[PDB]
Amino acid sequence: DVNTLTRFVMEEGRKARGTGELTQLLNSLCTAVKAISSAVRKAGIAHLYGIAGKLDVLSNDLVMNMLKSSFATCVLVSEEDKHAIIVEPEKRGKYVVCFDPLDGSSNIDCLVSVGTIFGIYRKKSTDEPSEKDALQPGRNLVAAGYALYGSATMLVLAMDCGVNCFMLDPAIGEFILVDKDVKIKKKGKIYSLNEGYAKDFDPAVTEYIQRKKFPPDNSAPYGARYVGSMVADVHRTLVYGGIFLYPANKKSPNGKLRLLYECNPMAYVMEKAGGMATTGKEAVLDVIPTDIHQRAPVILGSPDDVLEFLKVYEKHS
Amino acid sequence: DVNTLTRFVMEEGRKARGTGELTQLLNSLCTAVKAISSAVRKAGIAHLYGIAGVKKLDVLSNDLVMNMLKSSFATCVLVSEEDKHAIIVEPEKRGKYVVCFDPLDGSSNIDCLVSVGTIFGIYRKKSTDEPSEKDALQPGRNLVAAGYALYGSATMLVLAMDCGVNCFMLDPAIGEFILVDKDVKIKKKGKIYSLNEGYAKDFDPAVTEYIQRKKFPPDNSAPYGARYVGSMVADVHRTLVYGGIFLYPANKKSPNGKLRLLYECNPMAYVMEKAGGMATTGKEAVLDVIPTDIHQRAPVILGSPDDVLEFLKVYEKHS
Amino acid sequence: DVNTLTRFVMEEGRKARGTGELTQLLNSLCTAVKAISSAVRKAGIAHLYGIAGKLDVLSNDLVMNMLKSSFATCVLVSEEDKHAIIVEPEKRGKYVVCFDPLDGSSNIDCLVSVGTIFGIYRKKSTDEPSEKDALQPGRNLVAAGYALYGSATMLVLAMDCGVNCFMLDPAIGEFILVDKDVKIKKKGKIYSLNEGYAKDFDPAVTEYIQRKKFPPDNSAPYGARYVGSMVADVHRTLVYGGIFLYPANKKSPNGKLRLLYECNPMAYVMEKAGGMATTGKEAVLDVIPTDIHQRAPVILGSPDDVLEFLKVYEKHS
Amino acid sequence: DVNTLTRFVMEEGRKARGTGELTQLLNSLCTAVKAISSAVRKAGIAHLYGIAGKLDVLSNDLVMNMLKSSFATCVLVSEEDKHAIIVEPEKRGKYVVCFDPLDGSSNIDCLVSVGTIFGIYRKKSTDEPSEKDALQPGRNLVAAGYALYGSATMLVLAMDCGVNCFMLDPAIGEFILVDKDVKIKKKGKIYSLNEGYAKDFDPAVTEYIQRKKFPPDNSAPYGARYVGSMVADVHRTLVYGGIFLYPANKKSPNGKLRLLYECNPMAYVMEKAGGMATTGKEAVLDVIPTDIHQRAPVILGSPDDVLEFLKVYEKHS
Ligand SMILES: Nc1ccc(S(=O)(=O)NC(=O)NCCSSCCNC(=O)NS(=O)(=O)c2ccc(N)cc2)cc1
Ligand SMILES: Nc1ccc(S(=O)(=O)NC(=O)NCCSSCCNC(=O)NS(=O)(=O)c2ccc(N)cc2)cc1
């Protein structure tokens, strides 16, 4: 049986006997994603170039507008906005959503894969909504995932029931369920990080990478891949296995990537797929945020690979 | 004034007083690229999944390019990554051009939705003999045209001819390649290096030292950043766009590198050179290598002249 | 605020305190219509003409398959199928769907507008599902409408709340609401029938048409339009006002159009928009079917026009 | 072998050893036709309806700008512009083009099939380019045809070599040759006019239509079809055979349809396909225009059908 994103979610909803609010929310986001995908693949560019005689801002506008009009949200956090957005009282629903509408776009000039990342929370206070409703640990996520605009557009959705991947068929504008209850490999053969920053690495990251290129057990070295776009690298980590690293060094003690709308959703996807995501000190999903725009170290991927990194981290103390 | 690929090539043709053969071939190629782009983006995948109750993409891409080029009436010899032997176009469909192409580069990893691409190099037949595989055995210096299609966040066609390098965005809403960057030139010097460092244990000592210089600059400047998509078209396009260096060098295990000379290395070297960049094997210019086999491998270091010169300084140090 | 067919039907469902079965049915149907649209507009036709070296059957398979897999239906009646299709027990839901998956495909060779027509009923008994579950008068309809594959693809949906029109944006594959709670003009200025068959006309049809062309008063004669594709002619009638006729004559005493999947859904759309739909003798919606493929005469559109037709009809009764 | 519009045209040009200028013109026109098809099918409508928070004018702007930028044209006559457009000297080429950028669009509110009609002449005079250069008889056309935005988008091209039909594959944005050297049927079985004007018909049209409905020879009566959109009506006539009529009437004493960019192109297509196009008095292609927006009555289609009407017209003087 063919299945689609809308139908899949709605059927998980009907089981949980939900009110439809989360289905509405995910439907609207699905809509914004298709619209972002379309702008990203350059439909309409001919008009900009004079046929008849901004992208990350468009992407933010689409997500922001679609989530507000879903009547399922109350607080909206985005990379694009300094403060949390509070949904006008009339359009207010029970969920908080933290998103990065066009992750990777600093390098979209070279047509690198880009993505939208999102994490969904239930609001915490009956008390009127605020930016504080967004300051929750990843452990509280109701759902999370990303759209990848790579060679094709895929939406990866993580929920209680697991992680499921939906391909956008642009002939019909529908997300088709193609990979079910996805689980990451126990151990992969690829590591992924900016090695250009070698000089600044933590000694525990230095020794780990050393172990990948020069294996102490005489096994075959890991390959290295690093697109420089997080959704792309993380997606490859899910599909193929291995490890993705954006770690802390003494110059950036809290990494560079953003906890709420980058590290948490990816860590939640990872955990639902049987993988792991650590900061080094603790699970990313355990960190309790105080700033919506705070940064986090992130090491994620295959369980045996992350545990291997953690054993080195522990050694260096 | 808005410009399209067809209009751009046609106009260059009139300046040169051409018969029209190269324009027809580039039009057919660009029809193929759009059909490839559509299949790569998964148009109609819903039918594979039972929406109403088959070919792999590299096979389909090969069939698309092959069939479109044959039917162009502009070609006589076709060399593809996918076929062990050169295809000799039947007599009724022959033109004067020899095309070397990789129909879907990087597709080995297309399961993770990595950027893929098409690469092509076009030669005029030299000999007056019946066409054969030898007609494809020309150094890169003889290229008439070369370029690539990148199926990335968007689909862009990068074309190199004598007039220089021009970048055409595919507008999927209308199926037209729109000229969006004209006569493109690479940075003199970049800040990104690109290789698979996972195989560092097998590097040539010159590569080890070069990479060491990038990560730990003796002149104490800021290090270079690192990127490696692991898809040649992706990596080479970023190098053109942002500058820096792309390396797939020879080593002890692989003394001729891995990438293919005719339909990966040469087209990309030609594009780099027409954009003011460099491309070397370490010992020679990529475009100067005379092939003896159509599926032969070359080492390739390419990118910003200052960055490639710096690799060559280190290379020379180690002989 | 932007609205889509899914978000819209779902708001209606929450209002009505529904389980969501009908929304699932309508989402599935929507997915089918997008796939028909793409096919009808000839996406991928290059592959049939050898670039790399039937539409009525496909349309039927798209609708049947999406409906079965909706878990919302139990009996499916199609123009294409001799007998009613009974859904497998594990896939059964509460609704009966009567449809014409590609109406007008007889002349698709000339690229005439084509369409999909559907009518949704609730199954009325707890019996084992059979053809008889489809033998309901149009008054029993829960929802009905049509997709028109015209210069654009539009979906017109009638429910208790009235008639709403959704444009398919092919860029993103969403049905966008563009006309809310539509009502037909009280009187139009267009008549629509095949005048080539005038020697077979009912003397009443003869006189009515005569009056439109040669009015007794000083009024301008009506204009004439006849696409010959029902969805196109009925939609122009909804949009512009006027009258559409496929009436009985001596040779065909029950007309040519099919009651369950052509006449009834259009009668329902017409009546929810404040229009009328008669066989000449009674409302189309009141006819009790005894056969799934039985024919009905239909005269429909603006009420002043249909009432005027009935006046002439009675004159000869 | 698969053929495309660009490749077909360019091969015809090489046979005739032409400069390439007519190819440049026709490529530019086809690009415009793809952008019109995309706008007409409502790509991007979601943005109009606020997802991120005029058609005939755009269609005009598309054909104008693309034809100017071809370097192939010197004088442009459009339905949308009161006067001929004189191409600036730097963009001037040898062809004059008369076109209707979106024909039938006054009724597009009901998603009626629309189309683009074009007629291409070589500038005949050696004078400075002026409106006069557009006033040549249709006999002088070098090429003509239409894009029909119907259930699918098809470009129909008439040149010296015959009539060729190319379907737009929207998945790849390419016009594919589907029907080669097209010839109309010698006699058809459908007649096509607005019979709402029956009161204004002169005796010849009246007798002819009466003949179609009540065949003197006891042959089968003709079917009637009238979309009310010329491109749709004419294309069906080309595809199925039969006859299309838009005669003069009280409101339109010189006919309704425009000679330069409606009647001439269609008459040219008809004639290259072995059909016929008449005003009643003379071939449409023989009319020598005096004014760019002037109207002509038109009767066109299958040769035996036009001949039969012409025997009737003769009877009535
Ligand atoms: N029926 C018909 C249609 C069209 C014409 S026409 O007058 O427009 N003539 C043609 O269409 N002639 C054939 C087109 S030839 S295009 C001339 C431009 N030359 C060209 O592209 N040469 S090339 O060898 O392909 C070339 C391309 C690019 C470069 N850089 C160099 C050479 C008449 C009748
Ligand atoms: N006019 C009309 C239209 C439709 C109906 S109906 O019978 O079909 N009813 C509805 O459409 N009702 C809408 C409310 S039920 S739809 C969703 C089921 N709930 C749900 O998804 N809840 S959830 O909280 O969002 C949820 C989502 C995902 C998970 N995993 C868990 C819960 C009648 C009349």
The residue among B132, B153, B183 that closes a domain is: B183
> Contact, D190 vs D225, CB < 8 A?
yes
- Tokens, residue D63: 């054909």
A-chain residue closest to D39, CA distance: A44
Contact flag C45-D169 (C-beta cutoff 8 Å): yes
Report the CATH number that the domain containing residue C240 is assigned in CATH. 3.40.190.80
- A51, A57, A61, A70: best to mutate for the D interface, most D CBs within 10 A: A51
Give one word for C174, left, alpha or beta, with left for phi > 0 and alpha for psi -120 to 50. beta
**Resolution for the entry shown, Å:** 2.2
Ligand 1 in reach of B161 Cβ (< 6 A): yes
In the three-class reduction of DSSP (H, G, I as helix; E, B as strand; rest coil), residue C165 is classed as strand
Counting Cα atoms < 13 Å in the Cβ hemisphere of D280 gives 20
> Contact, D277 vs D271, CB < 8 A?
yes
Looking at the structure, do residues B2 and B145 belong to the same domain, yes or no? yes
Ligand 1 in reach of D196 Cβ (< 6 A): no
Cross-strand pairs, D235: none
- Tokens, residue A47: 């008009």
Q: How far is B37 from chain C (nearest CA, A)?
A: 12
Residues of B in contact with D169 (CB under 8 A): 175
Over its C-alpha atoms, chain D yields an Rg (Å, rounded) of 20
Cross-strand pairs, D169: D174
Between CA B254 and CA B264, with CA B260 as vertex, the angle to 5 degrees is 135
Nearest residue (CA) to ligand 2, atom 32: A13
Collect all residues with Cβ–Cβ distance below 8 Å to B46 and sequence separation of at least 6.
A2, A169, A171, A172, A174, A176, C35
- Tokens, residue B233: 């078209």
Collect all residues with Cβ–Cβ distance below 8 Å to C208 and sequence separation of at least 6.
C308, C309, C312, C313
Residue type, C8: F
The residue among B183, B214, B249 that closes a domain is: B183
φ, ψ at A153 (rounded to 5°): -100, 120
**Beta strands in chain B, from DSSP E residues, in sequence order:** 75-80, 87-88, 97-105, 116-124, 145-151, 155-161, 164-171, 176-181, 192-194, 225-226, 245-248, 278-280, 300-303
Whole-angstrom distance, CA of residue B177 vs CA of residue B91: 31
Q: What is the largest CA-CA distance in chain C?
A: 66
Q: Which of C155, C173, C151 lies closest to C165 in space, CA to CA?
A: C155
Looking at the structure, do residues B178 and B274 belong to the same domain, yes or no? no
In the three-class reduction of DSSP (H, G, I as helix; E, B as strand; rest coil), residue B94 is classed as strand
Looking at the structure, do residues C176 and C200 belong to the same domain, yes or no? no
How many other β-carbons are positioned within 10 Å of the β-carbon of residue A219?
A: 8
Looking at the structure, do residues B121 and B10 belong to the same domain, yes or no? yes
- Ligand 1 centroid from CA B20, angstroms: 4
Nearest residue (CA) to ligand 2, atom 33: C13
Q: What torsion do the CA atoms of C265, C271, C277, C282 make, to the nearest 10 degrees? A: 100
Q: What is the largest CA-CA distance in chain D?
A: 65
Looking at the structure, do residues B134 and B208 belong to the same domain, yes or no? no
Looking at the structure, do residues B27 and B139 belong to the same domain, yes or no? yes
Sign of dihedral through CA atoms A138, A139, A144, A149? positive
Looking at the structure, do residues B53 and B201 belong to the same domain, yes or no? no
Whole-angstrom distance, CA of residue B56 vs CA of residue B150: 19
Whole-angstrom distance, CA of residue D124 vs CA of residue D96: 9
In the three-class reduction of DSSP (H, G, I as helix; E, B as strand; rest coil), residue A204 is classed as helix
Give one word for A2, left, alpha or beta, with left for phi > 0 and alpha for psi -120 to 50. beta
Pocket test for ligand 2, best of C21, C23, C159 (most atoms within 8 A of CB): C23
Chain centroid to CA B214: 26
How many other β-carbons are positioned within 10 Å of the β-carbon of residue B2?
A: 20
Query: Which residue is it, tokens 């294996």?
Result: A215
In the three-class reduction of DSSP (H, G, I as helix; E, B as strand; rest coil), residue A231 is classed as helix
Ligand 2 in reach of A26 Cβ (< 6 A): no
Whole-angstrom distance, CA of residue C155 vs CA of residue B193: 53
Using CB atoms, pick whichever of D13, D34, D65 lies closest to residue B175.
D34
Pocket test for ligand 2, best of C5, C8, C19 (most atoms within 8 A of CB): C19
**Beta strands in D222-317, from DSSP E residues, in sequence order:** 223-224, 243-246, 276-278, 298-301
Solved by what technique?
X-ray
Report the CATH number that the domain containing residue D97 is assigned in CATH. 3.30.540.10
Whole-angstrom distance, CA of residue D101 vs CA of residue D93: 21
Using CB atoms, pick whichever of A27, A43, A171 lies closest to residue C6.
A27
Looking at the structure, do residues C171 and C29 belong to the same domain, yes or no? yes
Collect all residues with Cβ–Cβ distance below 8 Å to B254 and sequence separation of at least 6.
B297
Whole-angstrom distance, CA of residue A163 vs CA of residue C63: 29
Looking at the structure, do residues A104 and A172 belong to the same domain, yes or no? yes
Q: Which of A57, A56, A55, A136 lies closest to A98 in space, CA to CA?
A: A136
Q: How far are the Cα atoms of B113, B194, B311 from residue A194, in angstroms, in the given order?
A: 20, 11, 20
In the three-class reduction of DSSP (H, G, I as helix; E, B as strand; rest coil), residue D133 is classed as helix
- Chains contacting C with at least 3 CB pairs below 8 Å? A, B, D
> Contact, D190 vs D241, CB < 8 A?
yes
> Contact, B270 vs B285, CB < 8 A?
no
Whole-angstrom distance, CA of residue A313 vs CA of residue A305: 12
Burial of A315 (0-12, 13-18, 19+ CB in 10 A): exposed
Domain count for chain A: 2
> Contact, C256 vs C246, CB < 8 A?
yes
Burial of A175 (0-12, 13-18, 19+ CB in 10 A): buried
D94 annotated as ligand-binding: yes
The residue among C181, C212, C233 that closes a domain is: C181
Which domain range does residue A281 map to? 182-316
Whole-angstrom distance, CA of residue B16 vs CA of residue A303: 61
Looking at the structure, do residues D130 and D35 belong to the same domain, yes or no? yes
Burial of B308 (0-12, 13-18, 19+ CB in 10 A): buried
- Ligand 1 centroid from CA D160, angstroms: 18
C227 annotated as ligand-binding: yes
Ligand 1 in reach of B22 Cβ (< 6 A): yes
- Tokens, residue C151: 């210069």
In the three-class reduction of DSSP (H, G, I as helix; E, B as strand; rest coil), residue D308 is classed as helix
In the three-class reduction of DSSP (H, G, I as helix; E, B as strand; rest coil), residue D273 is classed as coil
DSSP labels for D15-66? HTT--SHHHHHHHHHHHHHHHHHHHHTTTTHHHHTTTT--HHHHHHHHHHHH
Burial of C15 (0-12, 13-18, 19+ CB in 10 A): exposed
Looking at the structure, do residues C212 and C94 belong to the same domain, yes or no? no
B-chain residue closest to C172, CA distance: B173
Q: Name the strands in the sheet holding C73-78, side by side, starting at the edge strand that comes first in the sequence.
A: C85-86, C73-78, C95-103, C114-122, C143-149, C153-159, C162-169, C174-179
DSSP H or E run through A93: strand A92-103
φ, ψ at D140 (rounded to 5°): -85, -10
Looking at the structure, do residues D25 and D169 belong to the same domain, yes or no? yes
